[PDB]
């Protein structure tokens, strides 16, 4: 894919963990928006943020979007055990599909 | 508001493929239907999507050929849901295509976020064997 | 579009077309019912301080007991039907709170005057 | 407080609750009847200029020889009712008197809408 | 002048006395009628955001299709019941016209007021 996540991210339960996503300026994030998604493997995803600052219903107030030029992240804040899960990220404007990236891995430690 | 998949079916290479994704609790119409592939190989893919009011589709340039988009007409139940189905066709299979496929629908009826994903059902599996 | 062309379309889409519907023996009591009718909430905005105008913004918070819904979640993804539907148990009381409101706002204005 | 439940007190207090009292063949006559006092005046307050508001200040200078009272021995020591008694056969010349003074304020509108 | 003693005067004359104007079984049909006009009217008025005023400028560009007319030809040189005449067939058009942009305007108020 254009787009690039980090292999994965960690730390502590409790602490705040950020996920970047990024590519081309064309694809991310010159007047793109960017959403996630958490999509733990052999199950259906769920979407948590969308243009780059609003949750999604259902969504904990502990996931929040912040943005960039040149990277969208993703953070979330008090870790726990439950967010140990793969996320992705896609761009996409109104007049386009969705561009996945290469997602990355969340673990949780102690 | 919940979205239902055919099962998981087995099928031989050039074999084309029929997908139903049953819907209720919402509007049939009121949303953008998506359909996503997932393979361990090459990640999430866009499918493209149809609309089911206006009949448009969008179809990602990699499934242009191959994949045909079709709903059914909705049929109401309540004065603000209705129930209905959109179905996927794939045409010449290949061991590349193999892998969970996905319903999803639209999260808003309008704004720049209108045909997001929102919703998804639980996926089936699609194998392809010689 | 037309008269309650806009009755399916989203909240936001809706408000373009507000003054589509703002204008608009047995016929003796129909053309005195449709005065009453009219006349109600004709009082209604002018007690808010909104006559005259289509929107009207007011000095009351929203009370999130009587929705948790994001403004998208309203406006770009309802209908006014809905809408209504959702407040309906609340419409009265809210119209209560912008009345208090306006008069506490017509007070402050006098003693403002009264000071200049 | 109710409909009228501010009858008995001060005019300064009576003030907070106007929009309370703003709020509302035999049959159909009796329809129409409540229907024109309305209108009446609404009439009267987009005569003065008045429409839409509650409190609506004047040019209007308050003549003495209707009332010699201060504003603390109106507002603080009266009631309405009591204050409209005091100057019961003054009525119209203030109503007269502020409709002359929106009449000057619409030819000086007039002047200002052509300069800019 | 008196009521409708403008009217054989040219239009820029009788601009002058709007404000005088503006005033003044088989009875209660009357008087069900004199009310139904007076809310046609007035309720035009508040859908154009004009309400309260006798003279009210709009956003709306005047077609020459309407009139081909100079200022000069027309408020100099006119009596309103020669005006009426000439865009007696234009006159529901330019109504629409008035409430499109009164309904844009508030919109744009708003989207201004969300920034404060
Ligand atoms: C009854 O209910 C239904 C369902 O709720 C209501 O329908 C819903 O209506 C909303 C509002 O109109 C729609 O949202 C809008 O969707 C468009 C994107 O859709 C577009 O892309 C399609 C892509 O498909 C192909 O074509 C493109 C062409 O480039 C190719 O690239 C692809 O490869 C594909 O081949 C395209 O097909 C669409 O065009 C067709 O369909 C539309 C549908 O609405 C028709 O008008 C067209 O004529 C044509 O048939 C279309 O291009 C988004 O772009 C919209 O977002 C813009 O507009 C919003 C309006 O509120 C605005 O808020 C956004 O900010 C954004 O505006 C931006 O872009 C504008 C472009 O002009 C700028 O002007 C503006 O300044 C700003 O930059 C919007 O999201 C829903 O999709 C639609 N839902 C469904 C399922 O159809 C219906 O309205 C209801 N009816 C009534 C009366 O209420
Ligand atoms: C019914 O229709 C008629 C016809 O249309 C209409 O009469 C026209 O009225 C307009 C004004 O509305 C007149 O146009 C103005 O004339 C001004 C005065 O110039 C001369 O006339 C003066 C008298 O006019 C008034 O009184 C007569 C009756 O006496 C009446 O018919 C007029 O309508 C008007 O009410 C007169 O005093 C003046 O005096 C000059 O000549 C005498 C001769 O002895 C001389 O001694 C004086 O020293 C002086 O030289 C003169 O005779 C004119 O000033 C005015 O222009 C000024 O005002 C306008 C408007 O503010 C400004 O734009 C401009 O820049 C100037 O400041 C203008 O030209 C028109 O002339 C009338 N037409 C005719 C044919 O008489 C009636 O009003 C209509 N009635 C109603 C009720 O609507
Ligand atoms: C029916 O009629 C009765 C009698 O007129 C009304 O009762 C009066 O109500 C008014 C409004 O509430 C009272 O006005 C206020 O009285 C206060 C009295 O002081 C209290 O505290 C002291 C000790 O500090 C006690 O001794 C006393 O008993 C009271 O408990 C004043 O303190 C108030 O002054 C403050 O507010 C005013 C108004 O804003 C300011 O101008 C002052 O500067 C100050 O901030 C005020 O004067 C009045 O006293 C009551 N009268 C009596 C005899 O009790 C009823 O209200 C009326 N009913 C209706 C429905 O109208
Ligand atoms: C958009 O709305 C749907 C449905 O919400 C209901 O229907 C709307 C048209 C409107 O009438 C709302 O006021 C109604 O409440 C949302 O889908 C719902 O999501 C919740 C949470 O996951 C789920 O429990 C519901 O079952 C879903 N639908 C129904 C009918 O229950 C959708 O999330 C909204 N999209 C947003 C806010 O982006
Ligand atoms: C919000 O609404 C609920 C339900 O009417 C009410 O109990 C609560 O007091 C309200 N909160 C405020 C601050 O008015
Ligand atoms: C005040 O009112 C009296 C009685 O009507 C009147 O005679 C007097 O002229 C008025 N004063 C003014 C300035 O109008
Ligand atoms: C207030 O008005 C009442 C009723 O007229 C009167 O009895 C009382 O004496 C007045 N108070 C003063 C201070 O004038
Ligand atoms: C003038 O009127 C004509 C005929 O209705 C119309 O086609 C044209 O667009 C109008 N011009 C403007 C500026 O509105």
């Known amino acids: 894919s254009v787009l690039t996540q980090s292999a994965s991210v960690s730390g502590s339960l409790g602490q705040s963990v950020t996920i970047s996503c990024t590519g081309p300026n064309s694809v991310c994030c010159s007047h793109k928006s960017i959403s996630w998604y958490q999509w733990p493997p052999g199950r259906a995803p769920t979407l948590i943020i969308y243009e780059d600052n609003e949750r999604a219903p259902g969504i904990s107030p502990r996931f929040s979007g912040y943005k960039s030029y040149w990277s969208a992240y993703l953070t979330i804040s008090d870790l726990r055990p439950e967010d140990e899960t793969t996320y992705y990220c896609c761009s996409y404007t109104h007049n386009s599909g969705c561009v996945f990236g290469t997602g990355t891995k969340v673990s949780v430690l102690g | 508001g919940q979205l239902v998949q055919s099962g998981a079916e087995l099928k031989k290479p050039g074999a084309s493929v029929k997908i139903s994704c049953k819907t209720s609790?919402?509007?049939?119409?009121?949303?953008?239907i998506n359909w996503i592939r997932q393979t361990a190989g090459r990640g999430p893919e866009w499918m493209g999507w149809?609309?089911?009011?206006?009949?448009?589709?969008?179809?990602?340039?990699?499934?242009?050929?191959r994949v045909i988009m079709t709903t059914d007409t909705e049929v109401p139940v309540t004065s603000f849901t209705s129930t209905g189905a959109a179905y996927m066709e794939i045409r010449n299979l290949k061991f590349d295509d193999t892998g969970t496929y996905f319903c999803?629908?639209?999260?808003?009826?309008?704004?720049?976020?209108?045909?997001?994903?929102?919703?998804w059902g639980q996926g089936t599996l699609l194998t392809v064997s010689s | 579009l037309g008269f309650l062309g806009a009755a399916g379309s989203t909240m936001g889409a809706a408000s373009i077309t507000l003054t589509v519907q703002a204008r608009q023996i047995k016929q003796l009591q129909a053309r005195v019912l449709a005065v009453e009718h009219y006349l109600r909430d004709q009082q209604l905005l002018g007690i808010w301080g909104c006559s005259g105008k289509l929107i009207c913004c007011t000095n009351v918070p929203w009370n999130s007991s009587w929705s948790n819904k994001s403004l998208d979640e309203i406006w770009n993804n309802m209908t006014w039907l809905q809408w209504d539907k959702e407040i309906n148990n609340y419409t009265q009381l809210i119209y209560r709170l912008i009345e208090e409101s306006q008069n506490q706002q017509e007070k402050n204005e006098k003693e403002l005057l009264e000071l200049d | 407080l109710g409909f009228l439940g501010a009858a008995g007190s001060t005019m300064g207090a009576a003030s907070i609750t106007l929009t309370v009292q703003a709020r509302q063949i035999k049959q159909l006559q009796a329809r129409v009847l409540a229907v024109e006092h309305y209108l009446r005046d609404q009439q009267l307050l987009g005569i003065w200029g008045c429409s839409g508001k509650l409190i609506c200040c004047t040019n209007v200078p308050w003549n003495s020889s209707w009332s010699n009272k201060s504003l603390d021995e109106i507002w603080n020591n009266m009631t309405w009712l009591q204050w409209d008694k005091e100057i019961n056969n003054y009525t119209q010349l203030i109503y007269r008197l502020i409709e002359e003074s929106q009449n000057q304020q619409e030819k000086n509108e007039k002047e200002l809408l052509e300069l800019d | 002048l008196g009521f409708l003693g403008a009217a054989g005067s040219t239009m820029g004359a009788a601009s002058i006395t709007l404000t005088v104007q503006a005033r003044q079984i088989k009875q209660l049909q009357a008087r069900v009628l004199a009310v139904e006009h007076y809310l046609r009217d007035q309720q035009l008025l508040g859908i154009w955001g004009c309400s309260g005023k006798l003279i009210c400028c709009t956003n709306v560009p005047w077609n020459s299709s309407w009139s081909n007319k100079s200022l000069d030809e027309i408020w100099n040189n006119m009596t309103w019941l020669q005006w009426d005449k000439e865009i007696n067939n234009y006159t529901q058009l330019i109504y629409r016209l008035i409430e499109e942009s009164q309904n844009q305007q508030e919109k744009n108020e708003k989207e201004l007021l969300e920034l404060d």
């Open positions: 999803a629908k639209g999260l808003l009826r309008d704004g720049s976020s209108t045909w997001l994903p929102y919703l």
């Open positions: 609790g919402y509007r049939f119409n009121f949303y953008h």
């Open positions: 149809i609309s089911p009011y206006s009949g448009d589709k969008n179809l990602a340039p990699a499934f242009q050929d």
